Design a protein around this ligand. Structure first.
Ligand SMILES: *[C@@H]1O[C@H](CO)[C@@H](O)[C@H](O)[C@H]1NC(C)=O
Lengths: 31, 49
């Protein structure tokens, strides 16, 4: 999830279908 | 109990994405349409209610 590269280079990632207590190989829980 | 079909579907690389609008937002849109068509008639679709 990024805006345009002419505006900014900040990145937000979404791990689909799993909770963030198992994702490692600002934390928000979503459906 | 037993392994579900949803786990077998997900475990083989096939996922299902959720819709953008939940059922509560669809219900709120329907409530707005009913309130407009009851209180105002057809005037809320042509501009101001
Ligand atoms: C997985 O995420 C759900 C939803 O936040 C949570 O209820 C559940 O406890 C999580 N599982 C863990 C932390 O093992």
């Amino acid at each position: 999830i990024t805006p345009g590269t002419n505006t900014s280079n900040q990145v937000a990632v979404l791990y689909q279908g799993v909770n963030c207590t198992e994702v490692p190989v600002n934390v928000f829980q979503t459906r | 109990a037993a392994r579900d079909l949803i786990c077998a579907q997900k475990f083989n690389g096939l996922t299902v994405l959720p819709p953008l609008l939940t059922d509560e937002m669809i219900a709120q849109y329907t409530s707005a349409l009913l309130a407009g068509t009851i209180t105002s008639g057809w005037t809320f679709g042509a501009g101001a209610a």
